Design an enzyme around this catalytic site. Structure first.
Site, PDB file in Angstrom:
ATOM      1  N   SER A 131       2.487   1.896  -4.765  1.00  0.00           N
ATOM      2  CA  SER A 131       2.334   0.475  -4.469  1.00  0.00           C
ATOM      3  C   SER A 131       2.017  -0.353  -5.726  1.00  0.00           C
ATOM      4  O   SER A 131       2.614  -1.418  -5.938  1.00  0.00           O
ATOM      5  CB  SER A 131       1.347   0.237  -3.334  1.00  0.00           C
ATOM      6  N   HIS A 184       0.833  -1.194   0.000  1.00  0.00           N
ATOM      7  CA  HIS A 184       0.000   0.000   0.000  1.00  0.00           C
ATOM      8  C   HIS A 184       0.868   1.243   0.000  1.00  0.00           C
ATOM      9  O   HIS A 184       2.035   1.186   0.331  1.00  0.00           O
ATOM     10  CB  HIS A 184      -0.915   0.047   1.227  1.00  0.00           C
ATOM     11  N   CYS A 185       0.233   2.361  -0.326  1.00  0.00           N
ATOM     12  CA  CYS A 185       0.890   3.639  -0.227  1.00  0.00           C
ATOM     13  C   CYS A 185      -0.127   4.606   0.382  1.00  0.00           C
ATOM     14  O   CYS A 185      -0.907   4.225   1.240  1.00  0.00           O
ATOM     15  CB  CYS A 185       1.507   4.038  -1.569  1.00  0.00           C
ATOM     16  N   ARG A 186      -0.130   5.873  -0.031  1.00  0.00           N
ATOM     17  CA  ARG A 186      -1.192   6.732   0.463  1.00  0.00           C
ATOM     18  C   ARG A 186      -2.513   6.516  -0.275  1.00  0.00           C
ATOM     19  O   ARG A 186      -3.599   6.437   0.342  1.00  0.00           O
ATOM     20  CB  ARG A 186      -0.760   8.200   0.408  1.00  0.00           C
TER      21      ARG A 186
END
Length: 179
Positions: free
Chosen positions: A125, A117-119
């Protein structure tokens, strides 16, 4: 192969990208891509059977997710953080190998499932997952990107797309894209 070709695979008829309609999606068997909110919701992670979390946006800015191994310690979830920035000049390819190795470790566990995941689950991601598919599953960049995009509305920035194209050219020359 060009960046423009990847832009086209991410784009509709009028030339627009789309935006994720869900906080997270399983993009290939046992590999999930999601946003900051799912990363920080441990009960939801457990209902999804997530055992491993790769935070591709680790840090303290408003473009990062400020988690660490300690956040997950009680839950028994295994963690790796990569301090990446979502910009066209950022060198994410420096992290493709360590990311791929973490995904492989998660999947080696019989019941392992990894959230990358990322933001936003949109640029950083998905780029790591596409690279993993190329490097470890021998999929060319167009088929790797297309399978992820089929399962989640993503949009890696053009610097990340260029990095994926450079990876593809190298792997193709090495004869490593023959599944």
């Amino acid at each position: 192969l060009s960046v423009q070709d990847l832009n086209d695979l991410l784009s509709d008829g009028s030339g627009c990208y789309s935006l994720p309609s869900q906080p997270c999606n399983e993009v290939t068997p046992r590999i999930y891509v999601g946003n900051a909110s799912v990363a920080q919701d441990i009960p939801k992670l457990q209902k999804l059977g997530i055992t491993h979390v790769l935070n591709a946006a680790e840090g303290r800015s408003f473009m990062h997710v400020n988690t660490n191994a300690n956040f997950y310690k009680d839950s028994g979830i295994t963690y790796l953080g990569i301090k990446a920035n979502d910009t066209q000049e950022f060198n994410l390819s420096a992290y493709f190998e360590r990311a791929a190795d973490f995904i492989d470790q998660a999947l080696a566990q019989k019941n392992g499932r990894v959230l990358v995941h990322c933001r936003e689950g949109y640029s950083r991601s998905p780029t790591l997952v596409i690279a993993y598919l190329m490097m470890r599953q021998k999929m060319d960049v167009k088929s790797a990107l297309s399978i992820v995009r089929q399962n989640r509305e993503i949009g890696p920035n053009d610097g990340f797309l260029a990095q994926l194209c450079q990876l593809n050219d190298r792997l193709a020359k090495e004869g490593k894209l023959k599944p």
